[PDB]
Design a protein around this ligand. Sequence first.
Ligand SMILES: CCCCCCCC/C=C/CCCCCCCC(=O)O[C@@H](COC(=O)CCCCCCCCCCCCCCC)COP(=O)([O-])OCC[N+](C)(C)C
Ligand SMILES: CCCCCCCC/C=C/CCCCCCCC(=O)O[C@@H](COC(=O)CCCCCCCCCCCCCCC)COP(=O)([O-])OCC[N+](C)(C)C
Ligand SMILES: CCCCCCCC/C=C/CCCCCCCC(=O)O[C@@H](COC(=O)CCCCCCCCCCCCCCC)COP(=O)([O-])OCC[N+](C)(C)C
Ligand SMILES: CCCCCCCC/C=C/CCCCCCCC(=O)O[C@@H](COC(=O)CCCCCCCCCCCCCCC)COP(=O)([O-])OCC[N+](C)(C)C
Ligand SMILES: CCCCCCCC/C=C\CCCCCCCC(=O)O[C@@H](COC(=O)CCCCCCCCCCCCCCC)COP(=O)([O-])OCC[N+](C)(C)C
Ligand SMILES: CCCCCCCC/C=C\CCCCCCCC(=O)O[C@@H](COC(=O)CCCCCCCCCCCCCCC)COP(=O)([O-])OCC[N+](C)(C)C
Ligand SMILES: C[C@@H]1CC[C@@]2(OC1)O[C@H]1C[C@H]3[C@@H]4CC=C5C[C@@H](OCCC(CO)CO)CC[C@]5(C)[C@H]4CC[C@]3(C)[C@H]1[C@@H]2C
Ligand SMILES: C[C@@H]1CC[C@@]2(OC1)O[C@H]1C[C@H]3[C@@H]4CC=C5C[C@@H](OCCC(CO)CO)CC[C@]5(C)[C@H]4CC[C@]3(C)[C@H]1[C@@H]2C
Ligand code: NA
Ligand code: NA
Lengths: 92, 92
Amino acid sequence: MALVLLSFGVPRKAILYPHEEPSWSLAKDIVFHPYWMIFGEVYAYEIDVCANDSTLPTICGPGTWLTPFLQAVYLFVQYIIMVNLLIAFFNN
Amino acid sequence: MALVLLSFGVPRKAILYPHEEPSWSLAKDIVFHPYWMIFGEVYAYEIDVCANDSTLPTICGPGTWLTPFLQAVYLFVQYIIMVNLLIAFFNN
Ligand SMILES: CCCCCCCC/C=C/CCCCCCCC(=O)O[C@@H](COC(=O)CCCCCCCCCCCCCCC)COP(=O)([O-])OCC[N+](C)(C)C
Ligand SMILES: CCCCCCCC/C=C/CCCCCCCC(=O)O[C@@H](COC(=O)CCCCCCCCCCCCCCC)COP(=O)([O-])OCC[N+](C)(C)C
Ligand SMILES: CCCCCCCC/C=C/CCCCCCCC(=O)O[C@@H](COC(=O)CCCCCCCCCCCCCCC)COP(=O)([O-])OCC[N+](C)(C)C
Ligand SMILES: CCCCCCCC/C=C/CCCCCCCC(=O)O[C@@H](COC(=O)CCCCCCCCCCCCCCC)COP(=O)([O-])OCC[N+](C)(C)C
Ligand SMILES: CCCCCCCC/C=C\CCCCCCCC(=O)O[C@@H](COC(=O)CCCCCCCCCCCCCCC)COP(=O)([O-])OCC[N+](C)(C)C
Ligand SMILES: CCCCCCCC/C=C\CCCCCCCC(=O)O[C@@H](COC(=O)CCCCCCCCCCCCCCC)COP(=O)([O-])OCC[N+](C)(C)C
Ligand SMILES: C[C@@H]1CC[C@@]2(OC1)O[C@H]1C[C@H]3[C@@H]4CC=C5C[C@@H](OCCC(CO)CO)CC[C@]5(C)[C@H]4CC[C@]3(C)[C@H]1[C@@H]2C
Ligand SMILES: C[C@@H]1CC[C@@]2(OC1)O[C@H]1C[C@H]3[C@@H]4CC=C5C[C@@H](OCCC(CO)CO)CC[C@]5(C)[C@H]4CC[C@]3(C)[C@H]1[C@@H]2C
Ligand code: NA
Ligand code: NA
């Protein structure tokens, strides 16, 4: 699960924040939102940053249309597969 | 589950957005919000678009009172039936 989290977090930050200098905040930002997604927070108004109802209108830029596809895959893997594998692990 | 998603998404968009011209955004809008509903996002202030606390007051129009009934059925089928069938699948 931790690996799936990073496999999503790193591309998301890289696509949405392409003009960043090196900083330890990068370590926070690749792990922070992907973790809270496991616990029922999809960040609904940040998914499509170029939509009218977006809370991140300044992040709208080239390639940002990729991040909803990434997040859709991420949560499928975490909830539909990995959370329920863990339920099945504990039941058995 | 993907079929249940479309069975909800298409009516929702059609009832709430009746004055749309053909566009590929239609493909996004029939699948987008119904998918994020699977992962704990009910879009609480968009359900009844004619309420005072609604975030979509301009969408208020004829027939829009139908969409809460549709969404109530949709989530019953997805969480109460289909998510727990999948848990039962993995356990067994
Ligand atoms: C069942 C329901 C679905 C039906 C499916 C039919 C598919 C039809 C395909 C339609 C694609 C064309 C639509 C957009 C028109 C082109 C220009 C455009 O507006 O681009 C938009 C983004 O989107 C893109 O740039 C490309 C999107 C391609 C992926 C679409 C899904 C492909 C099928 C599934 C793939 C999964 C794998 C499938 C195989 C397993 C621009 O949007 P923006 O982000 O707001 O950018 C503007 C702002 N900016 C200038 C600052 C950036
Ligand atoms: C292997 C399985 C494959 C699954 C199916 C294939 C995948 C789904 C196919 C979808 C069709 C493709 C949509 C193209 C729309 C183009 C419109 C556009 O301008 O850009 C959009 C595309 O950019 C995005 O970022 C949104 C992409 C949709 C993500 C869907 C994730 C949910 C997965 C669902 C999976 C369940 C599937 C259910 C069963 C079918 C973004 O719009 P915008 O940024 O707001 O642009 C400004 C526009 N405005 C000014 C009007 C606001
Ligand atoms: C246990 C607790 C529940 C008790 C049940 C008792 C039921 C009593 C029934 C009451 C119906 C009458 C109430 C509304 C008065 C009529 C006019 C009105 O205000 O309409 C409102 C909408 O609603 C409708 O237009 C019709 C709603 C009908 C469905 C109600 C549920 C029926 C039972 C269950 C059905 C499920 C299946 C059942 C069988 C299995 C207008 O609201 P709006 O959207 O804000 O529109 C105004 C704005 N606009 C002008 C822009 C549009
Ligand atoms: C098979 C099983 C059947 C289940 C029971 C039957 C179903 C439930 C029956 C409900 C009674 C019917 C309500 C009528 C109210 C009319 C009022 C009105 O003006 O319009 C409203 C009706 O329009 C809507 O869109 C809301 C409809 C309620 C959806 C309920 C979904 C939850 C299901 C629950 C299932 C669990 C049931 C629990 C066990 C009983 C909308 O109001 P508005 O748009 O804000 O209008 C402006 C008003 N304002 C100015 C004041 C803001
Ligand atoms: C493997 C398939 C090969 C690829 C082709 C087939 C894929 C679909 C077809 C084509 C791709 C989508 C084309 C539409 C977008 C082009 C327009 C555009 O500029 O869009 C954006 C950039 O977009 C890019 O720069 C394109 C990046 C593509 C990355 C690869 C896609 C993943 C394919 C994996 C597929 C696996 C499916 C799932 C697994 C089953 C927006 O840029 P802009 O905002 O206009 O720029 C202005 C910037 N300025 C304001 C700063 C000046
Ligand atoms: C099958 C039973 C037969 C149907 C009748 C009995 C059903 C129960 C009750 C009654 C039906 C609803 C009547 C109340 C609303 C009327 C007032 C009105 O205008 O409302 C709206 C429109 O509404 C319509 O145009 C009505 C659409 C009905 C669709 C069918 C209902 C589903 C029945 C399935 C039942 C299955 C139960 C679940 C399964 C167990 C609001 O319009 P407006 O905003 O005022 O318009 C102004 C527009 N302007 C501003 C642009 C000018
Ligand atoms: C298997 C995993 C692959 C991914 C990964 O883990 C292992 O690989 C690690 C490499 C790390 C970076 C290395 C060096 C620096 C330079 C530093 O420069 C100070 C700048 C400023 C501070 O404010 C001075 O004022 C800032 C931090 C940064 C960019 C690291 C960020 C985290 C990264 C990307 C880690 C990431 C989580
Ligand atoms: C089993 C499922 C039943 C439902 C469904 O899948 C299979 O059936 C598909 C038919 C599709 C539409 C066909 C043609 C067009 C015309 C095009 O015209 C360019 C306009 C503009 C673009 O910006 C030019 O500038 C826009 C797209 C649109 C309306 C399609 C939308 C998606 C639809 C509704 C699909 C839907 C998900
Ligand atoms: Na939740
Ligand atoms: Na939640």
